C-alpha cells in the first residue's frame, strides 16, 4: 500500500526565498553600488538593495562626528560632519514618524506602509533614475536622508596614520537601532526580507528528504550573536580634488563624492550567512545560498542583512507534517487507496516518515524530529557545496 | 534489562504453515520498531521482515513476499510472524530483534532463537 | 541486494597479535555495523557504524572504513575474542549482512 516517490522536491523552498540574497536582494550589503546613474554628465554607482540592512552605518574615521549629522557646509572644512542632508528647514530631512504621517496624511496607500518603507518612500522623492539613500532609526523613530551615497574610502595612499576624509561600514552597538536603505527597498520588506535571527537553527543544504550540514565553511572566533553578526557583515557581498568643491556648496560634485564610475557589482553574491553555536562560541560563515534550517537547540541562523540582536524562537516544526499530509491530495481514510509518499525522511510525528527501520530521535531537535536514515538518498554534495543528482540515478531526472 | 524471548518453532512439512510469538519485557514495547532475522546451517544472516511501532506498515524482502506476514500484540507485549507455503529454503534458526535510540539501522538486542526445520 | 564480501573465512591468531578481518559491498554504503557470534547463542552488537564500539565491548576492539572497504581490528587478542564475526550494512535496502569471518586461535 505505502509506495515511495521518486520526485525530488524541497517543502523549504517558500520559508527560504527571502534567505536567497542573491536573489530577493540583488546588490552588495557590505558596501552597496549596484545601480549607475547620471551624476551632472559622468556616469556614477549608487545604493540598488531590494532589502533593508539591519545596523549598518559609515563609522568616519578619527571623528567623534556621527555619519547621520549633516554634511559639512562651506566654513565647515576638513569634511568633518557627516553624510546626511544640510540641516536647512527640516520638512524633507530629519522627519520624525509623526511629521511624516503628517505631511503625507491625506494619502491613502502612503499611510498604509510601514515605518521602514514609509521614510524610504518619501526619502526617493527628490529630483535621471538617481534617488538618495536613508537611513531610519527606530529608536528615536527619525528618517535620515543621506547625500552622501558612498559607503567606503579606506584606500592605500590617503588614509593610513600620518584633512583627506576616511570610512568605512560596520555594526557597532551604537548602530544597532539604524536601518540602512537604497532608493529600490522593497515596501514589502517585512514579509519577503531577512530581520530576524533564527532561533533553535542552522542553516544546511536538502540533501533529498533531509536537511544536511554545510562542508565547507570559515570557522571564526564570535563571544555573543552581535560579533557573529558583526563579522558576517564585514565578509558580506561587497560592490567596491573632492576639497575644493565641498567648500563651495557644490550641489553635484558633493552628490557623486566618493563615487566610483567596468562592473564588479556582487549582485548579492558572497560570504552573506552564518551559524551561530552559543554553546562552544563559534561562527561558521559561507558563501552559497542555505536551502534549508537544522533545527539545533544550540545554533542561531543570521544574515548580513539580519538585525543584530533580534531572535524568532518559533522554529517551523509542522513544515514537513504539513507537506506529507498535503501530499496525500489523491482523495481530492485508506481502503480504496495505495499513497505515494513524499521524498521527507524527517517529521516531528515518527509514523507520518514510514521508515524502514528504526529512526533516529534526534536529542538536539526543539520540534522532537525523527530522522530516517536506513533508506538510498539520490544525492550528494559536491564541491563548492553544490548538491548535485548522483551518477546511479543521473538519466531518470 | 531488555528481554526477548521467541518459542514455537519445530518440524514442518514443505508447503505448509507455522506461526512464531516472542515475549518482550524490560521496556516499554510499543516505542520500538521489531525485527525478525534468520540464519541459515550454513551459518548465513538474513533479515526476514519488519514492523513499526503501531503495526500501521510491515517491510519484507522479494525472497518471503506473499507468503510471510509479521504482527504484533501491543496490549500483551508479542511480536509474530505467520509462515505460509514453506520450504527448505526457509530452515533456519530465526531471531526477532529490536532497533536502538541511534537511528542507523542496527540490531541492538536479539532473543535466545527458535529453530523451524523444514523437511518432509 | 548489496553483496558484502567477508575476507579471510579463516583467521588464527596466537594471544598477543594485531589482526584484522575485512569486508566489501558492491554498491557504496555510508557506514558499516559488526557483530560478535560465540557457538549455540545470537549474535551480540559489537561495533555500530564503522567507528562506535557497542556497550560493554572491550576498547582492544576497533573499526574504519569508508565508502566499500570497511575493517573490524583487534590490538590483541584473547582466547575470549575466539568467535564468528558478521559485517552488516542498512544504507540501501534490503538490509543484507556478510558470510562471516571465524577467529580461530593459536597454541
Known amino acids: 500500500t505505502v509506495e515511495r516517490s521518486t520526485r525530488m522536491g524541497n517543502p523549504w523552498k517558500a520559508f527560504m526565498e527571502k534567505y536567497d540574497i542573491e536573489r530577493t536582494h540583488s546588490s552588495g550589503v557590505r558596501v552597496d553600488l549596484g545601480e549607475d546613474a547620471e551624476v551632472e554628465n559622468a556616469k556614477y554607482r549608487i545604493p540598488a538593495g531590494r532589502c533593508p540592512v539591519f545596523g549598518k552605518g559609515i563609522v568616519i574615521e578619527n571623528s567623534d562626528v556621527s555619519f547621520l549629522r549633516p554634511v559639512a557646509t562651506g566654513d565647515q572644512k576638513l569634511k568633518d560632519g557627516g553624510f546626511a542632508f544640510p540641516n536647512a528647514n527640516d520638512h524633507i530631512s530629519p522627519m520624525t514618524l509623526a511629521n511624516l504621517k503628517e505631511r503625507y496624511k491625506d494619502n491613502v496607500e502612503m499611510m498604509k506602509l510601514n515605518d521602514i518603507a514609509l521614510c524610504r518612500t518619501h526619502a526617493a522623492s527628490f529630483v535621471s533614475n538617481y534617488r538618495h539613500p536613508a537611513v531610519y532609526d527606530e529608536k528615536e523613530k527619525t528618517c535620515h536622508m543621506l547625500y552622501l551615497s558612498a559607503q567606503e574610502n579606506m584606500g592605500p595612499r590617503y588614509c593610513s596614520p600620518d584633512a583627506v576624509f576616511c570610512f568605512k561600514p560596520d555594526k557597532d552597538e551604537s548602530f544597532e537601532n539604524l536601518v540602512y536603505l537604497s532608493k529600490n527597498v522593497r515596501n514589502d520588506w517585512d514579509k519577503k526580507c531577512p530581520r530576524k535571527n533564527l532561533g533553535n537553527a542552522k542553516f544546511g543544504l536538502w540533501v533529498d528528504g533531509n536537511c544536511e550540514e554545510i562542508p565547507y565553511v570559515k570557522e571564526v572566533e564570535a563571544e555573543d550573536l552581535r560579533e557573529c553578526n558583526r563579522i558576517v557583515f564585514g565578509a558580506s557581498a561587497s560592490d567596491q580634488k573632492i576639497q575644493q568643491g565641498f567648500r563651495q556648496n557644490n550641489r553635484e560634485m558633493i552628490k557623486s563624492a566618493f563615487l566610483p564610475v567596468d562592473n564588479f557589482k556582487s549582485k548579492g553574491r558572497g560570504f552573506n550567512w552564518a551559524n551561530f553555536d552559543s554553546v562552544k562560541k563559534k561562527c561558521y560563515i559561507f558563501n552559497t545560498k542555505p536551502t534549508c534550517l537544522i533545527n539545533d537547540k544550540n545554533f542561531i541562523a543570521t544574515t548580513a542583512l539580519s538585525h543584530p540582536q533580534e531572535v524568532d524562537l518559533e522554529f517551523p516544526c509542522s513544515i514537513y507534517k504539513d507537506e506529507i499530509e498535503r501530499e496525500i491530495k489523491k482523495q481530492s481514510s485508506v481502503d480504496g487507496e495505495r499513497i505515494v509518499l513524499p521524498r521527507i525522511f524527517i517529521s516531528n510525528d515518527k509514523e507520518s516518515i514510514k521508515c524502514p527501520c528504526e529512526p533516529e530521535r534526534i536529542s538536539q531537535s526543539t520540534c522532537n524530529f525523527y530522522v530516517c536514515n536506513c533508506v538510498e538518498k539520490r544525492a550528494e554534495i559536491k564541491e563548492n557545496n553544490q548538491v548535485v543528482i548522483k551518477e546511479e540515478f543521473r538519466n531518470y531526472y | 534489562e531488555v528481554q526477548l524471548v521467541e518459542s514455537g518453532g519445530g518440524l514442518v512439512k514443505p508447503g505448509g504453515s507455522l506461526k512464531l510469538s516472542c515475549a518482550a519485557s524490560?521496556?516499554?514495547?510499543?516505542?520500538?520498531?521489531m525485527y525478525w532475522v534468520r540464519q541459515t546451517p550454513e551459518k548465513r544472516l538474513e533479515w526476514v521482515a519488519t514492523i513499526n511501532d503501531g503495526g500501521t506498515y510491515t517491510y519484507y524482502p522479494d525472497s518471503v513476499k506473499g507468503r510471510f506476514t509479521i504482527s504484533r500484540d501491543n496490549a500483551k507485549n508479542n511480536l509474530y510472524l505467520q509462515m505460509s507455503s514453506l520450504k527448505s529454503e526457509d530452515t533456519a534458526m530465526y531471531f526477532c530483534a529490536r532497533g536502538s535510540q541511534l537511528g542507523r539501522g542496527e540490531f541492538a538486542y536479539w532473543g535466545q532463537g527458535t529453530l523451524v526445520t523444514v523437511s518432509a | 541486494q548489496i553483496v558484502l564480501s567477508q575476507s579471510p573465512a579463516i583467521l588464527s591468531a596466537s594471544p598477543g597479535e594485531k589482526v584484522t578481518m575485512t569486508c566489501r559491498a558492491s554498491?557504496?554504503?555510508?557506514?558499516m555495523h559488526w557483530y560478535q557470534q560465540k557457538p549455540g547463542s545470537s549474535p551480540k552488537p559489537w561495533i555500530y557504524?564503522?567507528?562506535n564500539l557497542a556497550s560493554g565491548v572491550p576498547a582492544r576492539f576497533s573499526g574504519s572504513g569508508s565508502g566499500t572497504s570497511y575493517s573490524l581490528t583487534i590490538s590483541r587478542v584473547e582466547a575470549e575474542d575466539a568467535a564468528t564475526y558478521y559485517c552488516?550494512?542498512?544504507?540501501?535496502?534490503?538490509?543484507?549482512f556478510g558470510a562471516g569471518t571465524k577467529l580461530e586461535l593459536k597454541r
Open positions: 552488516q550494512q542498512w544504507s540501501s535496502n534490503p538490509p543484507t
Open positions: 554498491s557504496s554504503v555510508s557506514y
Open positions: 557504524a564503522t567507528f
Open positions: 524490560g521496556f516499554t514495547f510499543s516505542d520500538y520498531y
